[PDB]
Design a binder for this molecule. Structure first.
Ligand SMILES: C[C@]12CCC(=O)C[C@@H]1CC[C@@H]1[C@@H]2CC[C@]2(C)[C@@H](O)CC[C@@H]12
Length: 241
């Protein structure tokens, strides 16, 4: 169980958004706290990724690129699990101090995306996803979006991605065929959700100075430098099906 030992050991702990819950639920306050949460979680995503088995086998530029393309999907998948285990999926548990009810879903102007995120959360229940399955699936999400022109050493990436697929297969194996199909269909469903959120993030950054929404340093950098490569089709998800 070496692989699962590692995934459990490096899983990030609780991250708070810093949200002042006694101010009114305005669009600007809610989106500014979500952006701050993203900035805080990005720190943990980087430290988590660098500690994954085999990750340092990747070229150093590929390491940062893969994090900078997959972070939305990783963060939404993890938030979906938090929601399933904490509020049982009619609310979104972005953080202990940033829990979206239906009112916040509307005031954030993200209601339809939150609905889809809620559906993703509920699938952990409908499919009875185990903690071990969640951990392996989340790791695989780091290796599920790349440039169409390929990475700087694509061969090492393809080997590492293969090995994470094998680990998922082992965790299921420890019926199997139906399970693997279910989990890979679930993984595929993350990318379209992440794409819609990437679109929202980009549009909000462009008009941020006018809706009074503050973007932290690394969020502003990644949404203006890397996210447009996804939105323009230069960086694309790897789907199973
Ligand atoms: C990743 C975050 C923050 C971390 C998390 O739990 C998931 C959530 C998904 C929506 C993202 C948000 C970060 C800030 C974004 C990108 C806003 O700009 C628009 C959509 C928000």
């Amino acid at each position: 169980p070496i692989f699962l030992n590692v995934l459990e050991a490096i899983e990030p702990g609780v991250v708070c958004a810093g949200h002042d819950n006694n101010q009114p639920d305005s669009f600007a306050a809610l989106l500014s706290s979500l952006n701050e949460l993203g900035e805080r979680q990005l720190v943990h995503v980087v430290k988590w990724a660098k500690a994954l088995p085999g990750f340092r086998n990747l070229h150093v530029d590929d390491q940062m690129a893969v994090i900078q393309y997959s972070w939305m999907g990783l963060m939404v998948f993890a938030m979906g699990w938090r929601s399933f285990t904490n509020v049982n999926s009619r609310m979104l548990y972005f953080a202990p101090d940033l829990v979206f009810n239906e009112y916040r879903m509307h005031k954030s102007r993200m209601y339809s995306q939150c609905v889809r995120m809620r559906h993703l959360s509920q699938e952990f229940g409908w499919l009875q996803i185990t903690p071990q399955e969640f951990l392996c699936m989340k790791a695989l999400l780091l290796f599920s979006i790349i440039p169409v022109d390929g990475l700087k050493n694509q061969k090492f990436f393809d080997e590492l991605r293969m090995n994470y697929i094998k680990e998922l297969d082992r965790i299921i194996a420890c019926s199997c065929s139906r399970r693997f199909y279910q989990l890979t269909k679930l993984l595929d469903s993350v990318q379209p959700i992440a794409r819609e959120l990437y679109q929202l993030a980009f549009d909000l950054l462009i008009k941020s100075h006018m809706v009074s929404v503050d973007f932290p340093e690394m969020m502003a950098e990644i949404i203006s430098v890397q996210v447009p490569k996804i939105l323009s089709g230069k960086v694309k998800p790897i789907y199973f099906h």
